[PDB]
């Protein structure tokens, strides 16, 4: 929840938007501007894919709201929309009921993926009918159509998968899980490519054994069950399961202490390890736990020695506006150009994240005046009603 | 007790007093002035009601006695006079016999409401008579009148509910609890609207099964009984119980440390979570537990990023007088206009809370001179007899 | 892993490259420049070999990237490519699940070698054939050729040892371990010296008892098994095993505290002890654990009294280029002279380790533009894409 | 080991070298210069011998390498070459597996001697022959010669005692320990005094009971075995054992904390206690454990009140040369006068201990150039190759 929540403001980020030369496109994969850093992340992506990252980590350094989290996430997108991305903040290690290296370990395990191939008993086909009498469904394969009667329980799941008549689905016989594959090929046009949104009519019987591929994390297995690692290694050896190290993003790196960096240095050498990407908005800091050793970003030298550092720069109000616009678009929030330009300007006086967070309040304030679009007047009101943290701390200082 | 005590100086606060446009009325729902902040809280109220507050919290920032606690409480009033409001101060986490995240957890559970529908055996009707012989009572429904004989125990409860002959009540057969519904409809005039202060004659028998609706908190269930959460979830699924997240108000936010903020960030993402409203009267502070990281209001950035910040401003002596007046009125304390004007002036030299606390001492000092109203002379004496903390610390400094 | 990883950037270091007079050669054994220090390490090497190091330790002092780790490793090379070298950093003692003197102890035991003579049942000879039917192998000795059939398990090991037809190998009958001795003498030319890359045809039978000599560390025995020390001493007394104290390199010496130095002082007097070599890039420091005692490099006087101190100096960009070149050559990375000269210059503005770490990213960036050699343009791009820690901390400071 | 190691650089120190008047001789008992302090230690020696030291301790104060450790050791020599001398440094109390007052206690017990008279079964005499056939030995007393056949075990011990034919020895029948008494009287000349290097032919039989006198410490009994103290007191009462309190030397006195000084003050009043001699190279220091109480040498007043303080002064390069010469002579290291004069000069720029430690490296560097004597050129090279701690910390500071 905190993590899905954490990644929601980045729902538009699909990758780094580079061309084949590895250079940044004007605007692609959701990203605009920040081109130098995007290109540096692309080198990281190639290094990771080449397995030339052994014992290295990444550090994104720059001010608040300069896309450090977006860029980390984009790296994981470029390895695959499948690849696990686990964002944390360093202060999360300080907790009253769990040791700090158990927090780190847990976050490591969230960042290591496993693709498991299993054969399951299913009922599958094109959904020829949905008739609540319980719900009757007809499923069609190349061999013909068969009727099922579904309990409310499986019907709810089918409704959750947004299954409609015309879709190809399967229903796992044991768990009752419903998977929507796409729309059946029968109904595709000449605009619709092969097996994408539209998929073939399944061959064979409605009721059959089907080879399914689950993407799970090593943490997702903990909750569903040391003993784990043993089974996982069995499965890889049998080519039943395949490891997929992901990305561990550690914002607020300076909140880590010496014991945390000792644990991290060691862990990131594991062959199955995720790539570790740190983020910092600070310069030189006393390394926490030492009391007097000052170091770039609060990271010990022997670690910094293995860290590839990419700088992120402040956006102009013009760049910020382009990004605020992607967020509004992605959110389904209608907003005038003048309103967006004002939000850009507010962002430059505060941060990008502050401007972005004003969209939802401005939108509701628009709805309340019977308007279905944010206008400049609503941005103006909202920004007089609410304060950024720097402005508020300053007023109260003075 | 400490919490009812905590909310007593806000007994006049009924809501935020905004119009349908969401703009502040001159004086409504007990609030006067502080209009910008009241309007910002109204946006929060709509966001909460729309469920657009996921992963956000609120921060009220301003000096002492600028209505931060009043405004938080007003938000809970606007969600419902039913909705749980739990005020705490951050230093309450530091306690010798309970861990700091057990304090926070307990305060979370006080801030989550549960409406439970139950059917109980009752005796109900209009109270046709009260005759202490034990006490004889006649209860009347549409089917007729029946006599009961009450033990002192239930009579005491009935007396506590301020039940008079003419009122419609019920008496729970098992617990012996007495509920006063209102005055019977039979005696209402043409000024008295339907089922308000005045309620219908109940239909059916005096003795019957009645569907009652209890508002409890998750903390109120702890005391009357992990195992709880299980039963509660059962009841929601059965539509027997309904959750009502309330408001958790955390004043003195800078007294929280890093472990507290890690626990809070996580907790406030729970789907059943109350809205968290922080309050601060400070500017930049070392985040407690870090020793060197300075931050607006002593809150870590990753939290501040999710916090909507509303500023509260100092009242003029004129505004303060309006508020001191509401408090006197609400208290039943008679006071001259000149006395109120003096209290306004004292408030500007000290704080609003200091002026407000002088009413009760001034009133007693009035009674002692045979006066049934506070006059300027009594405010003058009281303010020479007692000191505000700033004045006292200064005298002793010097 | 962290340790093999730790020694990888020094894979070119074969010794100290001194002549018989003990003076530094222009460039030999992988080292270039740093001649004074290399000559001082050569005195240490002779002292150790003479056993005149009793109760002394070594300190390498100089800035980051001046070869302190290389020189320590080179000392161990000069005692033997066999001699254990264990590099650590002082902050590694601070760990959440292991005491600080258990870290030190473990690192001591990694730095003490044991040569064990054992007689094992083997199959050996020249590999006359490799035929996967399982894999058939013919092994030839002076007495003739014998066929074996190997399971996939031993075949994998043989493949790991890079065994080819024509090589002399042995296969341990019990463990199944494969050892490649070299190419058979039969196929050597007049350029190929006796028993080096090329080794004799083994005498006797394919199947025989063979005296093998394993080099292990005292830590390598822990993992494969107090009780250990007892057995080890038995074996030395029987001339079955022979001790070989190695080198313990402790970088970041100032991260050690007083309890660590008390433990180290004592341990390094053990007769079986490794030589301890410290490294420092700092001047006077508060001795950690004391709060107020300042001392050269953060080391207590009574220790400093027993420490032989060798200074390492900054390389010019010209020297740095020579070293960057050895690393590229050793890596198999093609790079123009102009590109190397630029990396030298970058190294002088940053450190040698930063320049060296740019090779792999520059190389991949070269491959991506279809180039099989790094050119100046790729060094330029790479250095604009990535930042050194000093530059990044400075930008964010300002 | 650490302690024998600790006393090795003082192997030339035989006493304080004073005349009968108690005044310092130019050069005697290994000491040169430092005359005032030597004379003050001589008063201490007489006070101790008179038992007028009850509740007093000694403090040697002066810079590094001014002979504080030498002088402490010399005091113990003057009480007897037998008398236990236990040197420690105050930071040794801070250890992870032993409490700080258990370190102190252990060091107290090392500093208390016990002379035990025992009668043992022995074989003794003049060694008339050594014939390895096992080894045959003939032992001769006044009653005649007897042959023994020794196992390798006792022969090794005899070889360790440097026993030659012509020496008078005994061999303990039970333990197998070999003691070399000296050369037999039969072979002495008129230059050789009675019972010194040369001792009489033993009277009686080869095999006999012999009264032997072992010098042990109370710590030496711990390792070979509270219960101890009981037995020891038994033996003193029986005149079987005799106590000999020694000297406990505590360098780095300012590393002791308040709990250590409380334990020490108390312990040094024991009747069996060693004399405690502290050493300091510092002026006023915060007493460790107090945070704010400043005191000469970091010692509490009530202790300082009982401490007799002797100052040690810096040596000139001329005095230092005399001392460097004694060390070379004692070591068997040949060195020119010019080389010694250079070492004196180096010592004045650094410390005496630094110059002294350059002898062994300079000597090896001499051997390497085929020279059997250190010449100025070798001192020059060695001092350019290695650095003193002050010089190294300074370079790296700057
Ligand atoms: N170059 C960019 N293109 C598109 N979106 C961006 C870009 N940079 C930042 N963002 C977005 O702007 C918001 C703030 O960026 P974020 O990654 O949180 O910054 P940081 O982590 O540096 O504080 C996020 O919603 C993020 O997705
Ligand atoms: N705008 C307002 N209208 C009515 N009452 C107010 C207003 N602001 C503050 N109060 C009341 O004044 C007193 C002080 O305000 P409070 O909410 O405690 O201030 P704070 O929490 O900022 O110190 C309380 O009794 C409160 O109910
Ligand atoms: N004189 C030298 N000759 C060859 N390689 C060197 C030399 N000095 C340093 N190196 C190499 O340069 C890199 C940096 O040196 P390193 O030993 O890590 O420096 P330090 O430990 O002082 O920071 C390593 O790859 C090392 O092998
Ligand atoms: N006056 C002296 N005569 C002979 N040797 C001395 C004299 N002073 C010091 N030494 C010797 O010089 C070296 C340094 O002296 P040491 O006792 O360790 O000094 P400190 O303990 O004050 O640092 C030792 O080898 C010691 O035996």
UniProtKB/Swiss-Prot annotation, chains A, B, C, D:
Tissues where this protein is expressed: Ubiquitously expressed with high expression in heart, skeletal muscle and testis.
**What happens on changing residue 68 to M?**
No effect on interaction with NOPCHAP1
> Which GO BP terms sit in this record?
box C/D snoRNP assembly; cell division; chromatin remodeling; DNA recombination; DNA repair; positive regulation of canonical Wnt signaling pathway; positive regulation of DNA repair; positive regulation of DNA-templated transcription
Xref: Gene3D superfamilies: 1.10.8.60, P-loop containing nucleotide triphosphate hydrolases, RuvB-like helicase, domain II
Point out the cross-link Glycyl lysine isopeptide (Lys-Gly) (interchain with G-Cter in SUMO2) in this chain: 203, 394
Cross-link for Glycyl lysine isopeptide (Lys-Gly) (interchain with G-Cter in SUMO1), residue positions: 203
- Subcellular locations according to the entry: Nucleus matrix; Nucleus, Nucleoplasm; Cytoplasm; Membrane
- Key word ATP-binding present: yes
Q: What class of enzyme is it?
A: hydrolase
Which GO cellular component does the record give, naming just one?
nuclear matrix
**UniProt KW keywords:** Acetylation, Activator, ATP-binding, Cell cycle, Cell division, Chromatin regulator, Cytoplasm, Cytoskeleton, DNA damage, DNA recombination, DNA repair, Growth regulation, Helicase, Hydrolase, Isopeptide bond, Membrane, Mitosis, Nucleotide-binding, Nucleus, Transcription, Transcription regulation, Ubl conjugation
Q: Where are the transmembrane segments?
A: none
Q: Which SUPFAM superfamilies does this one have?
A: P-loop containing nucleoside triphosphate hydrolases
State the EC number(s).
3.6.4.12
Q: What is known of its domains?
A: Binding to MYC is dependent on a Myc domain essential for oncogenic activity.
Q: How does it assemble?
A: Forms homohexameric rings. Can form a dodecamer with RUVBL2 made of two stacked hexameric rings; however, even though RUVBL1 and RUVBL2 are present in equimolar ratio, the oligomeric status of each hexamer is not known. Oligomerization may regulate binding to nucleic acids and conversely, binding to nucleic acids may affect the dodecameric assembly. Interaction of the complex with DHX34 results in conformational changes of the N-terminus of the RUVBL2 subunits, resulting in loss of nucleotide binding ability and ATP hydrolysis of the complex. (Microbial infection) Interacts with Mumps L polymerase; this interaction regulates the viral transcription.
- Anything further noted? High level of autoantibodies against RUVBL1 are detected in sera of patients with autoimmune diseases such as polymyositis/dermatomyosistis and autoimmune hepatitis.
| Protein name, per record | RuvB-like 1
What is the protein's species of origin?
A: Homo sapiens (Human)
């Amino acid at each position: 929840t905190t993590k899905t929540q954490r990644i929601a403001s980045h729902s538009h980020v699909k990758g780094l938007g580079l061309d084949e030369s590895g250079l940044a496109k004007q605007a692609a994969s959701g990203l605009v501007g920040q081109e130098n850093a995007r290109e540096a992340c692309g080198v990281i992506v190639e290094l990771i894919k080449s397995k030339k990252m052994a014992g290295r980590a990444v550090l994104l350094a720059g001010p608040p709201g300069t896309g450090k989290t977006a860029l980390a996430l984009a790296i994981a997108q470029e390895l695959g929309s499948k690849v696990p991305f686990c964002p944390m903040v360093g202060s999360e290690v300080y907790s009253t009921e769990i040791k700090k290296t158990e927090v780190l370990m847990e976050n490591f395990r969230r960042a290591i993926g496993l693709r498991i191939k299993e054969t399951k008993e299913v009922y599958e086909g094109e959904v020829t009918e949905l008739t609540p009498c319980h719900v009757i469904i007809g499923l069609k394969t190349a061999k013909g159509t068969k009727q099922l009667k579904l309990d409310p329980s499986i019907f709810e799941s089918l409704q959750k998968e947004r299954v409609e008549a015309g879709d190809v689905i399967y229903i796992e016989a044991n768990s009752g899980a419903v998977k929507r594959q796409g729309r059946c090929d029968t109904y595709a046009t000449e605009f619709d490519l092969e097996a994408e949104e539209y998929v073939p009519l399944p061959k064979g019987d409605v009721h059959k054994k089907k080879e399914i591929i689950q993407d799970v994390t090593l943490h997702d297995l903990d909750v569903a069950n040391g003993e784990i690692n043993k089974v996982v290694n069995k499965y890889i050896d049998q080519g039943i399961a395949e490891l997929v190290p992901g990305v561990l993003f550690v914002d607020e790196v300076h909140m880590l202490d010496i014991e945390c960096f000792t644990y991290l240095h060691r862990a990131l050498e594991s062959s199955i390890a995720p790539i570790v990407i740190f983020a910092s908005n600070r310069g030189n800091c006393v390394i926490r736990g030492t009391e007097d050793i000052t170091s770039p970003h609060g990271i010990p030298l022997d670690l910094l020695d293995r860290v590839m550092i990419i700088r992120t720069m402040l956006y102009t109000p013009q760049e910020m506006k382009q990004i605020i616009k992607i967020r509004a678009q992605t959110e389904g929030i209608n907003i005038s150009e003048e309103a967006l330009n004002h939000l850009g300007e507010i962002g430059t006086k505060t941060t990008l994240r502050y401007s972005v967070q004003l969209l939802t309040p401005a939108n509701l304030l628009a709805k309340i005046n019977g308007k279905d679009s944010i206008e400049k007047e609503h941005v103006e009101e909202i920004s007089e009603l609410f304060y950024d943290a720097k402005s508020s701390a300053k007023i109260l200082a003075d």
